[PDB]
Design an enzyme around this catalytic site. Structure first.
Site, PDB file in Angstrom:
ATOM      1  N   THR A 278       0.837  -1.224   0.000  1.00 50.77           N
ATOM      2  CA  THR A 278       0.000   0.000   0.000  1.00 50.77           C
ATOM      3  C   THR A 278       0.861   1.260   0.000  1.00 50.77           C
ATOM      4  OG1 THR A 278      -1.735  -1.163   1.220  1.00 50.77           O
ATOM      5  CG2 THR A 278      -1.825   1.235   1.188  1.00 50.77           C
TER       6      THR A 278
ATOM      7  N   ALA B 297      -8.343  -3.619   5.943  1.00 53.61           N
ATOM      8  CA  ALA B 297      -9.405  -2.927   5.225  1.00 53.61           C
ATOM      9  C   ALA B 297     -10.715  -2.948   6.001  1.00 53.61           C
ATOM     10  CB  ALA B 297      -9.596  -3.559   3.853  1.00 53.61           C
TER      11      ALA B 297
END
EC number: 3.4.25.1
Lengths: 200, 197, 204, 231, 232, 242, 228, 246, 212
Positions: A1, A49
């Site tokens: 990420t 997430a």
């Protein structure tokens, strides 16, 4: 990420990638990492997430409740304070979260960084994820407060591309958002394979 | 990393700290502030873990301001310090223990200035000068060498600059700019930050 | 260990009609000095003193709670407390936390306000009182003072010899320990006066 | 005074509060339900006063209800039934029967009749269902007493319908569906002040059987069952 | 003496039959629906020429598509309104869609007859709320209006008035309704009804007006968006 | 625990406990408030001075925070409790949110507190009617009011306690824009008003004044007597005019 | 359980249930307590209403510890409660301080309880006023508690059925320099004025507090003293 | 369980509570108490009621108590209910010391009590406490302090007060013979001995139906002392002589 | 002890302009043995939505029971059926409920969009979902996902036409893919079940594979 955000004269800008991995197997490559909390706020995903979605939904709900009760849009400072005091009750369990709250209040733009440990801090340039280290170098050498809009876009895009080139757990597509005095807008969503040729 | 220092004079107090934050390889900020204003002539310098510092400091701040707005006067530092120590030792033996160190420089109209010390185990010593962090090793001795009870103001500032130069010479971490404040019979005053190019 | 995280030492002796108590005055964290004026001896009434050693936070906590209970006792019915009663109270206070205890080793020294009969006591981590006529020791330098007080002490001792005895022992016992020293404080009690003194020690 | 509380027997063994609650069922809109050899029917009146509330609900694919009391307390018992049936399906994987459900409902309602500061539920219920042993019609009152009948009705001036049914009792078990519907609708028609006729904006009907899971009909689908009337 | 959950010799609770008489002392409110939205108008009932009229909030917002007018005791209402809001949001949290007006009114009514001394009373509820509400909003099936009493028996309607003089005004509102009536005619009719029923006068300050017409969200009329229609 | 119904309805709605609590205020001490252009005034009075009392201790004008003040016209034991709760909430709000409170926030808080005790079991309603005043951000002076029922309305010049009827009737005919022009003028109004309920002149007055960023003030009897004599001279001149 | 007070202030400002309880000790088997320098004396009176009844099974003078005594005037059933409570508080004090509890503290705590049973949920006040004797640091102690929670440090008091006529008789005879031999005579003779019929030992019980421990005298001693 | 309750906490039709204003009616029949503050100390006088063959002088005193090193109280109501408020005050002061490690100011200690008996008028169902008091103390912010209290959580500071039987006549005769800042601890005791025999129903004082306490500061420490029979005998004799001077 | 197990059972889903497809194997295993060969992992919730699960079996079963118990609750409390987006948003929360003792199932949902289109939702055992076009979760994910992205996304193919998908083409593609992914994986085989969702309703198929 890799997720970055920075603020300047004409407001704040946010950028992110679109890859998700499970070990060494690429699960998906079309993820949404720039969360749309409200028409005046924005978020960011990094780490887990499920968490970075659940808690931000709760935050949006609380913001709406406040707006209804007091008849005044909430501020960024109080929003980040809420978000930080919410996950602090789950210290040392396994939660992983790194988040950026962006907005524009009665005293101007606002950018805050938050995490599961508890450190909540302001700033003007931020970048998190496994590829933040490669993006800091490009963002610093090129940053300026009296910049135009047509240039900050390319700056953030190039930062993300150069982060994906080296880091293996990050790639896919590039998402970019821009916040203003009225609200935010989705300006573009590009691909890395379509940028590689744009450069050399 | 972290660095707090406090010095006491005959009619004033001088405190200083660093202003830096980082996540294991990179410093996110360079304009931090580790100080907290509990009242008009009291200052709390806290440092340590990530999310415990602000929680503890704001709890203390709320309770002190409440005492003020409830009774009609302020709280003496020798009292705020023991309040802090009691609360911290109490919360040390629970499910949510706090891991922080702090100083409580202050000033009073009856007993004059004051400077205290804590070590995240609720000790509450008291000294005419003190320091925290690893850097304390390379700057405590200096004090013991050049400090005098009747130390004036500019001389204390010069001693501080000396300790900071030593830090920037032998210490591995950068720590390039510091925040310094002073407390006197009229109140709190902020001075030009000690910065090294 | 955790007990020796800071360091401390305290001792008490007995004489003819006067008792004595002594302690060191250093404060540090496991290898380092912070200040040399730490208080370990507290007055629990007149002609009755208590000295604690071990963990400093528990030192202060015990002192405060003991003052609480003692003031309430004195106010309830008006009488200066006796030493044995204090021994039992501290025993209860330390045993209430058999699981999750403190880490202090108290030492009590005083007289009786009906015959001025001396009394000294030493407790343990959980309240095992051990009354001794010779003396009592508590701290990290205990085996360096046992063998020192067993070689000088005598049954009857005048105040001056009592002061010259407890001092040499304490000094030459802390001079062989590294986590205790940097000053010595002595308190001598009498039928109608108390004398407090500080000695000359090495600061190494 | 033996009237203000629910824990005071009268000198003649009468708890006045339960009677005072029962008197709340003889003021609401009337409802009727009769049984056949294969199906079960329920109807209502929906006294509009110019809109009013519904008077029939759904409990599960094989059980439905008709209420004639306080609408606030009826939703409570409805929720109770829905949860009991969900539990029986989750654990055993089987549709809960009707007898055990009505027994549970009866026990749920006896407690407040035996202690301080409570009040009895002031709602009566008609229950229609179907199981292995065929159809079933049950009645429930505020007092925790449940019956098993071939035909019943509740509400104001429900005596005329009761008489009409006692006279037409020996006709069911062979009539078809629409014949049952007509019988019920012409039985209900007597609980009116001889100044109004049944219409589409008043009647609501539910139907259950071995081939259908308790279907309800609204004001726009009742017309097919209105043909075949008299004076 | 008597209790709170005690019946009468008519099948009627006592506290509720007594509280319903309170709404006969409050101000009046009117709610109407049509094929293209609803309308809510209310009265303020001023007392002195020194009170700031902008502080009287009788028509609040439950969400972007629901509204509410209230009469009776303005205080007891503040506990229900919040609840509604909360419920709505939780819906959006779990299902990512909007709540129906039927569902909102049902969830609110479920909190009406929760009162008694037996339970430990952590909620401390000891008596019923004296208020009469009037909701209204767009949904998946056109616009809806509802009515609620202090007994929890909500029922849908087409045009309803509540308050002190909500006895004869309902007749006038019963005459002037047709399924194909529009919004403007409804607003004018409600306004003239309030004029004939009100005592002092009809100014653009002593009234609150609101609409939930489809396409748009809840709206409150300004001081300038009102007088332009009172010139009749 | 105690779980019994203290306040309940009646054949006319008519919650009786509140109707009764409202009667104490009708015999307490008069209070007056005024919202000027750049100042706010509180003129609590009706003090029973005995000449052997420390004026500090019994005051009745209190500060909940640097922004907000307050006055009350009923039982004091309950007023102290209310003020303490309100200070607590002001601090908690300043903690969570990084900005001070607004008048409406704390007023609504107090109103909810007042109403909770008209519905809860084992609790008895308060017997105070407060008079709050404050300076929101961007100035905007604000004066509010409250009752033991749970209501609250924003007023321009309202009065409570005994004799508040005459005070309101006198004020509604004197408060004008041309009458409110300076700080010295706003105060004279309060003294003229209290002169009616007043018993033996300006011996019982505890005036105060809130301006932009003074955070409080209280006057000494010297200026009180000066203003009293000025009002007397104005009255003499007006009488000569008639 | 009920949660509200049954003792309440009257319009005149007085708690009336306390007075109504104080009217119970009026009939309470008169008792007597006398103080001297070498100790203290306590003496009750019994009212066995049959020869079929027993004598060596019922005891009014019950000890608390090795140095403190007790006696009552009023409701028996409501006296064992206080006896048990006191025997518990004494042992608590011992376990804490490792020393017998003084007398005044015991009276304080007992009265605190007798008052806590005055505005609690669904109870009534007791129907007894105690009298307790003790010895501490070389001095006797006599105390008297009431159903309201108030205790006084008396000196040769009396209570029961004829106390108004028992304290005036006791005023004109207390020399204040007596030994623990004639104070017992005085105790006996006082209640001798409030006794109907022939007196004996089985109709009397006695206890003393000298510097050896609270004790109860067997019938032999009472008989020896009953001989003038 | 509803026909046995008085509800104990109810607004009368006129806006007044009844139990509180009743307890205030009994307070006016208890031991007369009086309190004065002088530039150099604070004195507290009281009147006794028990005169018999009692074991007097067994404790420190009968009506005066102690709360800390620098405070005292002179409760003048029901004794049973008062024996617990002193415990509460001592607990409060010791907790304050334990937390802030400093002596507790007096106003805080008065408020923390006036809040304990306010709940007894609102919640619960219990009868309230029926005692009014008079606190004396010294602090480093305002110096000498005398304070009052009432059954319903209501308090106020003063210069000179009297409560109990015949408190009104005393408060009247006292607001004239009191010079502002023109008083000492030598004349305050005289005025006390004066008002006490001008108010008490007995022809004169025998120094056995009275009690006095003085609080002063002597060499940093604070002294709270009661007077022996000889001192009060000398005082009453000097008062007799002064009156004879007229 | 260990409170988990591994049973296998790959799953596959596909979406189209007016149809959706959900395919599963049919077998149950524990270690190196075979429990049975008739245990489908595809279930039908309403007339336009189906769901498949894979992993630990007990959790699968109880989760299906839970979902079926809550759909009826929604229908009762709102008087209307539940859509696809609503079921996904409810499943996210139901899963996150047990964040510290999670399930071990990889769910997939297929059905019809609000208007007339096809929708697919892929989930994780914690509750992170996102709408996709094709997904092949399960044990053999790595074998099918790299294939469905070429013949259906046309990746790494130049000068190729889009030629949108159809019904029979997708069916035959699914059949061939699962027939090829049985000769390399050992937890998959012995039959294949297909559920198809269209404007009309829900249809089922069945195919046979090799028996190891």
């Amino acid at each position: 990420t890799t997720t970055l955000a920075f603020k300047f004269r004409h407001g704040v800008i946010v950028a992110a990638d679109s890859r998700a991995t499970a070990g060494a197997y690429i699960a998906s490559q079309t993820v949404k990492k720039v969360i749309e909390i409200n028409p005046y706020l924005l978020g960011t995903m990094a780490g887990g997430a499920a968490d970075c979605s659940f808690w931000e939904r709760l935050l949006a709900r609380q913001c709406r409740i406040y707006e209804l009760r007091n008849k005044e849009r909430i501020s960024v400072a109080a929003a980040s304070k809420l978000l930080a005091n919410m996950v602090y009750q789950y210290k040392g369990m396994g939660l992983s979260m790194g988040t950026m709250i962006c907005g524009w209040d009665k005293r101007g733009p606002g950018l805050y960084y938050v995490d599961s440990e508890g450190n909540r801090i302001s700033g003007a340039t931020f970048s998190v994820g496994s590829g933040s280290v490669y993006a800091y170098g490009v963002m610093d050498r090129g940053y300026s407060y009296d910049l135009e809009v047509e240039q900050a876009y390319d700056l953030a895009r190039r930062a993300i591309y150069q982060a994906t080139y080296r880091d293996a757990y990050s790639g896919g597509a590039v998402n970019l958002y821009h916040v203003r005095e009225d609200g935010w807008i989705r300006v573009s969503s590009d691909n890395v394979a379509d940028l590689h040729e744009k450069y050399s | 990393m972290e660095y707090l220092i406090g010095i006491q004079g005959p009619d004033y107090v001088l405190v200083a700290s660093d202003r830096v934050a980082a996540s294991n390889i990179v410093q996110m900020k360079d304009d931090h502030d580790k100080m907290f204003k509990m009242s008009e002539k009291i200052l709390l310098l806290c440092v340590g873990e990530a999310g415990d510092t602000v929680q503890f400091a704001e709890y203390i701040q709320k309770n002190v301001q409440l005492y003020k707005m409830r009774n009609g006067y302020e709280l003496s530092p020798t009292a705020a310090a023991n309040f802090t120590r009691r609360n911290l030792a109490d919360c040390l033996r629970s499910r949510t223990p706090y891991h922080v160190n702090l100083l409580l420089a202050g000033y009073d109209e009856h007993e004059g200035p004051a400077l205290y010390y804590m070590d995240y185990l609720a000790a509450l010593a008291k000294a005419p000068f003190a320091a925290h962090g690893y850097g304390a090793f390379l700057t405590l001795s200096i004090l013991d060498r050049y400090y005098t009870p009747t130390i004036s103001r500019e001389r204390a500032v010069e001693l501080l600059r000396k300790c900071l130069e030593e830090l920037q010479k032998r210490f591995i971490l950068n720590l390039p700019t510091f925040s310094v404040r002073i407390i006197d019979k009229n109140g709190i005053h902020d001075l030009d930050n000690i910065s090294f190019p | 260990s955790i007990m020796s995280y800071n360091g401390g030492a305290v001792m008490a002796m007995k004489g003819k009609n006067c008792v004595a108590i002594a302690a060191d005055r250093r404060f540090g964290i496991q290898a380092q000095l912070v200040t040399t004026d730490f208080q370990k001896i507290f007055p629990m009434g007149d002609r009755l003193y208590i000295g604690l050693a071990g963990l400093a936070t528990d030192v202060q906590t015990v002192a405060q709670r003991l003052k609480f209970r003692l003031n309430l006792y004195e106010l309830k019915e008006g009488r200066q407390i006796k030493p044995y009663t204090l021994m039992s109270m501290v025993a209860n206070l330390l045993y209430e936390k058999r699981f999750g205890p403190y880490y202090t080793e108290p030492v009590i020294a005083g007289l009786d306000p009906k015959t001025f009969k001396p009394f000294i006591c030493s407790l343990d981590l959980i309240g095992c009182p051990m009354v001794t006529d010779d003396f009592v020791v508590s701290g990290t330098c205990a085996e360096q003072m046992y063998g020192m007080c067993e070689s000088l002490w005598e049954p009857n001792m005048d105040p001056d010899h009592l002061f010259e005895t407890i001092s040499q022992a304490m000094l030459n016992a802390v001079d062989r320990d590294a986590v205790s020293g940097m000053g010595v404080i002595v308190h001598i009690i009498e039928k109608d006066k108390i004398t407090t003194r500080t000695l000359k020690a090495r600061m190494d | 005074q033996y009237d203000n509380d629910v824990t005071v027997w009268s000198p003649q063994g009468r708890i006045h509060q339960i009677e005072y609650a029962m008197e709340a069922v003889k003021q609401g809109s009337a409802t009727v339900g009769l049984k056949s050899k294969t199906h079960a029917v329920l109807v209502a009146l929906k006294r509009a006063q110019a809109a009013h509330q519904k008077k029939i609900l759904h409990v599960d694919n094989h059980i439905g209800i008709s209420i004639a009391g306080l609408t606030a307390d009826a939703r409570l018992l409805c929720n109770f039934m829905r949860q009991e049936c969900l539990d029986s399906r989750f654990v055993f994987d089987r549709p809960l029967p009707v007898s055990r459900l009505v027994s549970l409902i009866g026990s749920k309602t006896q407690i407040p009749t035996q202690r301080y500061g409570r009040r009895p539920y002031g709602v009566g219920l008609l229950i229609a269902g179907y199981d292995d042993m065929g159809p079933h019609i049950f009645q429930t009152c505020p007092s925790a007493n449940y019956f098993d009948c071939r035909a019943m009705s509740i509400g104001a001036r429900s005596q005329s319908a009761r008489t009409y049914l006692e006279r037409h009792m020996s006709e069911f078990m062979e009539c078809n569906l629409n014949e049952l519907v007509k019988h019920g609708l012409r039985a209900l028609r007597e609980t009116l002040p001889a100044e109004q006729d049944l219409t589409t904006k008043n009647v609501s009907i539910g139907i259950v059987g071995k081939d259908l899971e308790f279907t309800i009909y609204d004001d726009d689908d009742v017309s097919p069952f209105l043909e075949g009337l008299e004076e | 003496d008597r209790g709170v959950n005690t019946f009468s010799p008519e099948g009627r609770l006592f506290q509720v039959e007594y509280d319903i008489e309170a709404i006969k002392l409050g101000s009046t409110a009117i709610g109407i629906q049509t094929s293209e939205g609803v309308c809510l108008a209310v009265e303020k009932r001023i007392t002195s020429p020194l009170m700031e009229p902008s502080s009287i909030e009788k028509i609040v917002e439950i969400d972007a598509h629901i509204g509410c007018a209230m009469s009776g005791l303005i205080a007891d209402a503040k506990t229900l309104i919040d609840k509604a809001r909360v419920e709505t949001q939780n819906h959006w949290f779990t299902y990512n869609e909007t709540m129906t007006v039927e569902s909102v009114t049902q969830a609110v009514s479920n909190l009406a007859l929760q009162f008694g001394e037996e339970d430990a009373d952590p909620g401390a509820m000891s008596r019923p709320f004296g208020v009469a509400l009037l909701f209204g909003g767009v949904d998946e099936k056109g616009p809806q209006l509802f009515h609620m009493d202090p007994s929890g028996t909500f029922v849908q309607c087409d045009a309803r008035a509540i308050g002190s003089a909500s006895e004869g005004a309902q007749s006038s509102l019963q005459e002037l309704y047709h399924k194909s009536m529009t919004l403007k005619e409804a607003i004018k009719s409600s306004l003239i009804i309030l004029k004939q029923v009100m005592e002092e006068k009809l100014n653009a300050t002593n009234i609150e007006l609101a609409t939930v017409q489809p396409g748009q969200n809840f709206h409150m009329f300004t001081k300038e968006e009102l007088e332009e229609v009172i010139k009749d | 625990s105690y779980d019994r119904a203290i306040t309940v309805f009646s054949p006319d709605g008519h919650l009786f406990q509140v109707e009764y609590a409202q009667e104490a205020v009708k015999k307490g001490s008069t209070a007056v408030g005024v919202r000027g252009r750049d100042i706010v005034v509180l003129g609590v009075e009706k003090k029973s001075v005995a000449k052997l009392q420390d004026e500090r201790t019994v005051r009745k004008i209190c500060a909940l925070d640097d922004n907000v003040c307050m006055a009350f016209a009923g039982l004091t034991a309950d007023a102290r409790i209310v003020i303490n709760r309100a200070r607590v909430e002001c601090q908690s709000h300043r903690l969570t949110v990084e900005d001070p409170v607004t008048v409406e926030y704390i007023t609504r808080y107090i109103a909810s507190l007042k109403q909770r005790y008209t519905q809860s079991n084992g609790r008895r309603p308060f017997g105070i009617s407060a008079l709050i005043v404050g300076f929101d951000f961007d100035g905007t002076p604000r004066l509010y009011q409250t009752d033991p029922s749970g209501t609250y309305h924003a007023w321009k010049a309202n009065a409570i306690g005994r004799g508040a009827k005459s005070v309101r009737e006198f004020l509604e005919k004197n408060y004008t824009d041309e009458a409110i022009e300076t700080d010295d003028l706003t105060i004279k109004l309060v003294i003229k008003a209290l002169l009616e309920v007043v018993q033996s002149g300006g011996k019982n007055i505890e005036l105060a004044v809130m301006r932009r960023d003074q955070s409080l003030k209280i006057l000494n009897p010297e200026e009180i007597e000066k203003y009293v004599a000025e009002i007397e001279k104005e009255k003499e001149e007006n009488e000569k005019k008639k | 359980g009920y949660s509200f007070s049954l003792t309440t202030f009257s319009p005149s400002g007085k708690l009336v249930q306390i007075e109504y309880a104080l009217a119970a000790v009026a009939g309470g088997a008169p008792s007597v307590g006398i103080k001297a320098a070498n100790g203290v004396v306590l003496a009750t009176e019994k009212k066995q209403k049959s020869i079929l009844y027993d004598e060596r099974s019922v005891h009014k003078v019950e000890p608390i510890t090795k140095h403190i005594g007790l006696v009552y005037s009023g409701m028996g059933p409501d006296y064992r409660v206080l006896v048990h409570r006191a025997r518990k508080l004494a042992q608590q004090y011992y376990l804490v301080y490792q020393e017998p509890i003084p007398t005044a503290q015991l009276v304080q705590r007992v009265a605190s309880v007798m008052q806590e049973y005055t505005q609690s949920g669904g109870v009534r006040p007791f129907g007894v006023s105690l009298l307790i004797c003790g010895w501490n640091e070389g001095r006797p102690y006599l105390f008297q508690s009431d159903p309201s929670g108030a205790y006084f440090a008396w000196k040769a008091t009396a209570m029961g059925k004829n106390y108004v006529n028992g304290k005036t008789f006791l005023e004109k005879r207390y020399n204040e320099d007596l030994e623990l031999e004639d104070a017992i005579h005085t105790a006996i003779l006082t209640l001798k004025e409030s006794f109907e019929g022939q007196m004996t030992e089985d109709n009397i019980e006695v206890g003393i507090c000298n510097e050896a421990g609270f004790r109860r005298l067997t019938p032999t001693e009472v008989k020896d003293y009953l001989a003038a | 369980s509803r026909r046995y309750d008085s509800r104990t906490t109810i607004f009368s039709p006129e806006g007044r509570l009844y139990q509180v204003e009743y307890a205030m009616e009994a307070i006016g029949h208890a031991g007369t108490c009086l309190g004065i503050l002088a530039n150099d100390g604070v004195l507290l006088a009281a009147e006794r009621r028990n005169i018999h063959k009692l074991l007097d002088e067994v404790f420190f005193s009968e009506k005066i108590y102690k709360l800390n090193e620098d405070m005292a109280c002179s409760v003048a109501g029901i004794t049973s209910d008062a024996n617990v408020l002193t415990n509460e005050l001592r607990l409060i002061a010791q907790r304050y010391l334990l937390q802030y490690q400093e002596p507790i100011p007096c106003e805080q200690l008065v408020t923390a009590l006036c809040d304990i008996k306010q709940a007894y008028t609102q919640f619960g169902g219990k009868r309230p406490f029926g005692v009014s008091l008079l606190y004396i103390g010294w602090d480093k912010h305002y110096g000498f302090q005398l304070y009052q209290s009432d059954p319903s959580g209501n308090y106020g500071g003063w210069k000179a007060t009297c409560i109990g039987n015949n408190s009104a006549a005393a408060v009247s005769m006292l607001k004239q013979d009191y010079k502002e800042g023109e008083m000492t601890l030598k004349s305050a005791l005289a005025l006390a001995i004066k008002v006490l025999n001008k108010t008490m129903d007995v022809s004169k004082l025998s120094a056995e139906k009275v009690e006095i306490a003085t609080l002063t500061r002597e060499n940093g420490k604070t002294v709270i002392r009661v007077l022996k029979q000889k001192e009060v005998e000398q005082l009453i004799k000097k008062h007799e002589e002064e009156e004879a001077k007229a | 002890f260990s409170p988990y197990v591994f049973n296998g059972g790959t799953i596959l889903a596909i979406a189209g302009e007016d149809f959706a497809i959900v395919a599963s194997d049919t077998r149950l295993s524990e270690g190196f043995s075979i429990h049975t060969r008739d245990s489908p992992k595809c279930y039908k919730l309403t007339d336009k939505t189906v769901i498949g699960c894979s992993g630990f079996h007990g959790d699968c079963l109880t989760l299906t029971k839970i979902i079926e118990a809550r759909l009826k609750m929604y229908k009762h409390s709102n008087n209307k059926a539940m859509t696809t987006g609503a079921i996904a948003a409810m499943l996210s929360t139901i899963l996150y409920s047990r964040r510290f003792f999670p399930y071990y199932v990889y769910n997939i949902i297929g059905g019809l969009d609000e208007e007339g289109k096809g929708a697919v939702y892929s989930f994780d055992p914690v509750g992170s979902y996102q709408r996709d076009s094709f997904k092949a979760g399960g044990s053999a994910s790595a074998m099918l996902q790299p294939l469905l992205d070429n013949q259906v996304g046309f990746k790494n193919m130049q000068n190729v036409e889009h030629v949108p998908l159809s019904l029979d083409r997708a069916m035959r593609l699914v059949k061939d893919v699962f027939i090829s992914a049985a000769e390399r994986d050992v937890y998959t085989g012995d039959a294949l079940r297909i559920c198809i969702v269209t404007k009309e309703g829900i249809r089922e198929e069945t195919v046979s594979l090799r028996k190891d």
